Amino acid sequence: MKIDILDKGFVELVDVMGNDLSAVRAARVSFDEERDRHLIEYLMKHGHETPFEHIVFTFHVKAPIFVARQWFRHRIASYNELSGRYSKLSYEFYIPSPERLEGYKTTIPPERVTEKISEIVDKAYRTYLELIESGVPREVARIVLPLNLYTRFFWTVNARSLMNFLNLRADSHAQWEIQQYALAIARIFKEKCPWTFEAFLKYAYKGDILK
Amino acid sequence: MKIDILDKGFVELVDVMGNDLSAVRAARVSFDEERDRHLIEYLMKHGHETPFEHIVFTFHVKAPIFVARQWFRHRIASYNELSGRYSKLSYEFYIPSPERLEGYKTTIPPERVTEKISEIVDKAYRTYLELIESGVPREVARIVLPLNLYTRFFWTVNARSLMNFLNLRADSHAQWEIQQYALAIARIFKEKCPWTFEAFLKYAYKGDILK
Amino acid sequence: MKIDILDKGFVELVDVMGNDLSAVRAARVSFDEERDRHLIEYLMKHGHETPFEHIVFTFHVKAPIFVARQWFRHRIASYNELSGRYSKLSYEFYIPSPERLEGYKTTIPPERVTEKISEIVDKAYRTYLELIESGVPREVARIVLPLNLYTRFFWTVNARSLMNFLNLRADSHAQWEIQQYALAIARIFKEKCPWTFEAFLKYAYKGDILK
Amino acid sequence: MKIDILDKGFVELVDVMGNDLSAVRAARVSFDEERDRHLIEYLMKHGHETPFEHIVFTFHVKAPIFVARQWFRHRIASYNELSGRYSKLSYEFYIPSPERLEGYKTTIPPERVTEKISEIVDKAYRTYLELIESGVPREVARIVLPLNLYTRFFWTVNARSLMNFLNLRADSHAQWEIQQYALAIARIFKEKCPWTFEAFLKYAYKGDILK
Ligand SMILES: Cc1cc2nc3c(=O)[nH]c(=O)nc-3n(C[C@H](O)[C@H](O)[C@H](O)COP(=O)(O)OP(=O)(O)OC[C@H]3O[C@@H](n4cnc5c(N)ncnc54)[C@H](O)[C@@H]3O)c2cc1C
Ligand SMILES: Cc1cc2nc3c(=O)[nH]c(=O)nc-3n(C[C@H](O)[C@H](O)[C@H](O)COP(=O)(O)OP(=O)(O)OC[C@H]3O[C@@H](n4cnc5c(N)ncnc54)[C@H](O)[C@@H]3O)c2cc1C
Ligand SMILES: Cc1cc2nc3c(=O)[nH]c(=O)nc-3n(C[C@H](O)[C@H](O)[C@H](O)COP(=O)(O)OP(=O)(O)OC[C@H]3O[C@@H](n4cnc5c(N)ncnc54)[C@H](O)[C@@H]3O)c2cc1C
Ligand SMILES: Cc1cc2nc3c(=O)[nH]c(=O)nc-3n(C[C@H](O)[C@H](O)[C@H](O)COP(=O)(O)OP(=O)(O)OC[C@H]3O[C@@H](n4cnc5c(N)ncnc54)[C@H](O)[C@@H]3O)c2cc1C
Ligand SMILES: O=c1ccn([C@H]2C[C@H](O)[C@@H](COP(=O)(O)O)O2)c(=O)[nH]1
Ligand SMILES: O=c1ccn([C@H]2C[C@H](O)[C@@H](COP(=O)(O)O)O2)c(=O)[nH]1
Ligand SMILES: O=c1ccn([C@H]2C[C@H](O)[C@@H](COP(=O)(O)O)O2)c(=O)[nH]1
Ligand SMILES: O=c1ccn([C@H]2C[C@H](O)[C@@H](COP(=O)(O)O)O2)c(=O)[nH]1
Ligand SMILES: [Cl-]
Ligand SMILES: [Cl-]
Ligand SMILES: [Cl-]
Ligand SMILES: [Cl-]
């Protein structure tokens, strides 16, 4: 499962351990489907969340740095990210669509906002490359690059921590850009753990986007 | 893979996510085997441990309470255990073999130590059952049961946290009983992640039992 | 602040870092009291919990093993506990009061339950000491001791993790014995962080005992 | 204690809980100085690290985003940071000194590298302000700002996690800029916990800068 996000981003599921029944078993310490689903709903409605820690996902995510900065605040998870110390960074930036400013009256046209953002990221990358090609170490040269630069990372997260992520990021209070990533994560979670996901939405989910 | 431990215990692998290449990919943020193995050795010799967090195991363990008490100190992991509040606990106790006291001069024969331990656990269980059958709540009745009572749990742990567990518990300083569990865990880890395990032993393992 | 719990237990505050204003500052990234209290209520009502991580407590707790087993499931915290490998364990056991069985019809008198529990713990300790004095290693001898043995530990926990503890343990679903410890912890928390505590009760606390 | 770092940064100690004796007590589960220091050295030389979790610091740090990105990878800690969604961000950027490129042959003079970096950050901030003043939401406008923008955060971290931070960041392999922050953190740690710090350097510290 891979899902395009923003202009150049994505979320892809790399691997998964377990399923709805992993939670039921772990909860039972196990050596019918009606009862297994009822147990899942029971755990979720009563706040017994530890059984869902036995379901684990790994994702590969391509996202702008400002999104990754928010995402990496989720400590109960594992990350490995592309390094600007160790590699030349690619010319790939998130440029908002003109629809991104719908709702806001602006004293310059939304298409001109879009062009101003493109212009400055182009000048910044041009400076970065000039510095690199003059022998400035990569780890110093990259400091001129803007926060809308794309980066990539692997994320390994269990279903309990993923539910926390969805409560906080699949929600109107989160920045729109990370909401879009959260909606993709939710779609994948629903596909792999349908009983857990539906019970989550019904009983435990705290946000206001997923339905 | 299931391995008998002590007189009545076991360790069984329930599920696993990933393999040696999960660490190599996560480390590379990947979209030959000589080079993949060399990278693993490189990460291990230099202390780059986060890539190993993307390999995850779930075990089902049957162990005495005093062993479980030590094991559950490992916080960077997930546990679900049989409850003495919620179920009648089974008459199953760890009785040391007479060889357990080899090295120690004792003023009573090692076989008589073994019998004294059996005798007291029998009296304790008899009291527990008397209390249960008189209508004492299970959660109170069980408090008379000794620390050598067997319990069971599911344990979900990533390879980095598992390496920490092995450093501390597959080692002469750990209590012999948990060492035996750690040796089983190591065998399973070696089988599922041979490059990681061998690199761990060569470069990072801090204990004094595994070879 | 020290508070007696059960027959022989206690909870004592050893140290604390910070206060209500630590959360306000951390939240503001700070270089009036009406507004500082309003901010605390705001964070709590909206689920902004990370600012409360900057308030930290250390407690010294004396509790029976079966209570400690439940308590030590709280992973987002730090523990150091008395060792039965490293010391001779003291003859101190939790003996329920006869009022502990109020609500339950029992086919033996509650005072006789109390005596049966005393009798078995006395026999168990007598066996433990016999084994110790015959040269059995402490770490083996102790396995005959029951779960109502008292132990002692230091617990270092931040206010966010403490609120989670109180949601789960200051609640009717938790075992009565640990509820009594949780009520003491809550009293200390209220004393040291009154604005945070009152805002917690009003907006975020999930249990059904604290008022 | 406050220490200037880089051109415009700082590290300041806001609060601390405990001292060397907190570790000794927690380790002993306590109800002379020669022996207390010997215990600290003992714990450190043998890898008994949990007692140091009972010493906790809070710092206020002003650092460029690229430094903060590395720092916030340390998950076993607590953070609260200034938000570009919620505030107008200040015109403050890290401009490397010309000495930062000592060792590297560059095909443009180090002073001209310094000017090129200043020039691009000035153009970027000018764009950011133009967008803000045209009614673009702050959370979108800020995406044009470079990684050398200064940010500020509160960091609450225990001494065990701080030792891990120092092993990794007070070391030649870490980026020079974060090394400078780590050296300041080490100075503060040494001042507040001299026995722990000296024992750390002697027995456990894995880096190659602190002496
Ligand atoms: C709309 C929005 C606005 C935000 N604005 C800001 C801001 O202005 N500044 C800012 O710095 N941050 C901000 N954040 C980030 C926020 O403070 C958290 O870092 C982020 O939401 C991750 O949440 P978490 O701690 O629950 O997740 P994780 O770190 O994954 O933790 C998961 C759970 O584990 C527990 N936990 C983990 N570590 C600890 C610990 N050390 N102590 C106690 N419990 C722990 C908690 O129960 C937590 O819910 C914002 C987040 C959102 C959604
Ligand atoms: C031989 C032996 C004797 C022992 N004797 C005693 C004893 O007498 N009393 C006693 O109480 N305990 C004792 N322990 C338990 C020991 O104190 C640890 O709780 C246990 O070894 C788990 O280790 P850990 O913290 O590394 O593992 P985990 O808790 O899984 O943590 C893994 C890693 O995460 C980090 N970590 C996790 N949480 C935190 C945190 N809050 N702060 C900082 N870093 C964190 C550390 O880097 C740690 O190594 C003993 C252990 C051994 C092996
Ligand atoms: C009434 C009651 C009955 C119980 N019955 C049982 C039982 O029968 N069997 C049993 O095994 N346990 C039982 N428990 C224990 C329970 O499963 C938890 O271990 C305990 O409540 C601690 O909760 P916690 O994980 O929220 O706390 P902590 O471990 O302190 O974690 C705090 C927060 O950090 C987050 N967190 C920490 N680590 C992880 C992680 N690895 N992944 C995801 N999120 C994490 C979560 O947001 C969590 O709320 C019972 C608890 C209660 C209160
Ligand atoms: C020179 C250098 C280069 C780096 N290059 C890269 C890079 O190119 N890409 C990149 O993504 N990162 C990079 N890092 C970051 C690195 O991968 C770590 O995220 C960072 O060093 C924090 O280390 P930590 O996990 O030990 O600390 P913390 O996250 O604070 O954890 C402390 C300890 O707790 C334990 N721990 C905490 N959480 C878990 C968990 N979920 N599972 C198992 N154990 C856990 C471990 O014992 C750990 O040592 C680099 C770091 C350094 C110093
Ligand atoms: O919605 C938000 C706002 C802030 N932050 C965290 C991420 C950064 O560490 C810091 C500042 O982020 P921005 O507000 O600048 O995105 O707070 C989030 O995680 N989510
Ligand atoms: O080798 C040991 C010794 C102690 N402990 C922890 C477990 C308990 O929380 C406490 C006391 O354990 P015993 O020494 O009684 O086993 O310290 C361990 O984890 N391993
Ligand atoms: O109310 C409970 C019930 C269980 N447990 C955890 C503690 C043990 O690890 C295991 C079994 O505990 P008992 O139900 O036997 O107390 O589950 C709790 O933390 N709280
Ligand atoms: O020395 C380093 C290199 C990388 N990273 C982490 C931080 C980011 O999440 C990611 C990329 O950082 P840079 O290499 O671009 O600084 O890896 C570090 O923590 N320290
Ligand atoms: Cl490119
Ligand atoms: Cl049986
Ligand atoms: Cl005594
Ligand atoms: Cl300004």
Tokens 């050893």 sit on residue: C14
Question: Taking a C-beta distance cutoff of 8 angstroms, is the pair D14, D68 a contact?
Answer: no
User: Parallel, antiparallel, or unpaired: how do β-strands A9-17 and A56-64 relate?
Assistant: antiparallel
Question: Taking a C-beta distance cutoff of 8 angstroms, is the pair B134, C110 a contact?
Answer: no
CA distances from D109 to A70, D99, D101, D112 (A): 37, 11, 10, 5
Could you say which of B15, B25, B53 has the minimum Cβ distance to residue A22? B15
- Residues with beta carbon inside 6 Å of ligand 6? B 66, 69-70, 73, 174-175; C 81, 83-85
Closest C-alpha to A146, from A203, A187, A94? A94
- Nearest chain D residue (CA) to B76: D76
Closest C-alpha to C144, from B122, B120, B126, B101? B120
Ligand 6 site-directed mutation target among C81, C132, C144, C147, most atoms within 8 Å of CB: C81
Q: Count how many Cα atoms sit within 13 Å of the Cα of residue D88 in the half-sphere of its side chain.
A: 12
Q: For residues C30 and C42, what is the distance between their CA atoms, to the nearest angstrom?
A: 17
CA distances from B156 to A54, A158, B21, D143 (A): 6, 10, 20, 39
* The residue count for chain A: 211
Q: For residues B146 and B128, what is the distance between their CA atoms, to the nearest angstrom?
A: 11
Could you say which of D26, D79, D156 has the minimum Cβ distance to residue C80? D26
- Which tokens go with C50? 């990370």
Question: Taking a C-beta distance cutoff of 8 angstroms, is the pair B125, C114 a contact?
Answer: no
Q: For residues D69 and D58, what is the distance between their CA atoms, to the nearest angstrom?
A: 18
CB under 8 Å to B125, separation ≥6 — which residues? B91, B93, B145
- Which tokens go with A6? 């923003």
Angstroms from B177 CA to nearest CA on chain C: 9
Cα(B90) to centroid of ligand 10, in Å? Answer: 4
Question: Taking a C-beta distance cutoff of 8 angstroms, is the pair A15, B18 a contact?
Answer: yes
Contact between A58 and B26 using a beta-carbon 8 Å cutoff: yes
* Beta bridge mates, C156: C58, C78
CB under 8 Å to B180, separation ≥6 — which residues? B5, B6
- Which tokens go with A121? 């990221």
Could you give the 3-state DSSP secondary structure of residue D171?
A: coil
Q: Resolution, in Å, please? A: 1.7
Identify whether B152 is a catalytic site residue: no
Does the CB atom of residue D173 touch ligand 4 within 6 A?
yes
Tokens 């039992």 sit on residue: B209
Q: For residues C196 and A13, what is the distance between their CA atoms, to the nearest angstrom?
A: 40
Q: For residues B199 and B186, what is the distance between their CA atoms, to the nearest angstrom?
A: 13
- In chain B, DSSP assigns E strands to 2-5, 9-17, 56-64, 78-81, 150-158
Question: Which phi-psi region, left, alpha or beta, contains residue C29 (left: φ > 0; alpha: ψ -120 to 50)?
Answer: left
Could you say which of C60, C82, C158 has the minimum Cβ distance to residue D78? C158
For chain A, list the contacting chains (3+ Cβ pairs, <8 Å).
Answer: B, C, D
Q: What is the number of domains present in chain B?
A: 1
> Count of CB atoms within 10 A of residue A202's CB?
11
CB under 8 Å to D2, separation ≥6 — which residues? D10, D11, D12, D13
State which H helix or E strand residue B184 sits in.
Answer: helix B176-192
Q: Count how many Cα atoms sit within 13 Å of the Cα of residue D2 in the half-sphere of its side chain.
A: 10
Backbone angles phi, psi at D56, to 5 degrees: -130, 140
Sheet strand arrangement including A2-5: A2-5, A9-17, A56-64, A150-158, A78-81
First and final CA of chain B: distance in angstroms?
A: 21
Q: For residues C193 and A27, what is the distance between their CA atoms, to the nearest angstrom?
A: 36
CA B71 to chain centre: 6
Helices C110-133 and B110-133: angle between axes, nearest 10 degrees: 170
Ligand 8 site-directed mutation target among D65, D66, D67, D69, most atoms within 8 Å of CB: D69
- Check residue C204 and report its DSSP letter: T
> Count of CB atoms within 10 A of residue B111's CB?
10
Q: For residues C143 and B65, what is the distance between their CA atoms, to the nearest angstrom?
A: 9
The amino acid present at D5, given as its one-letter code, is I
Closest C-alpha to C156, from D53, D18, D19? D53
Q: Domain containing A164 — which CATH number?
A: 3.30.1360.170
Parent domain of A133: 1-211
* Beta bridge mates, C169: none
Task: Name the residue with the closest Cα to ligand 4, atom 28.
Answer: D74
CA B172 to chain centre: 15
Count Cβ atoms within 10 A of the Cβ of residue D35 and give its class: 0-12 exposed, 13-18 middle, 19 or more buried: exposed
Closest C-alpha to A30, from C127, B62, C33, C26? B62
Buried b / exposed e along C54-66 (16+ C-beta atoms within 10 A): bbbbbbbbbbbbb
Could you give the 3-state DSSP secondary structure of residue A55?
A: coil
Question: Taking a C-beta distance cutoff of 8 angstroms, is the pair A192, A57 a contact?
Answer: yes
- In ligand 1, the atom with minimum distance to the C-alpha of D153 is 11
> Count of CB atoms within 10 A of residue D46's CB?
11
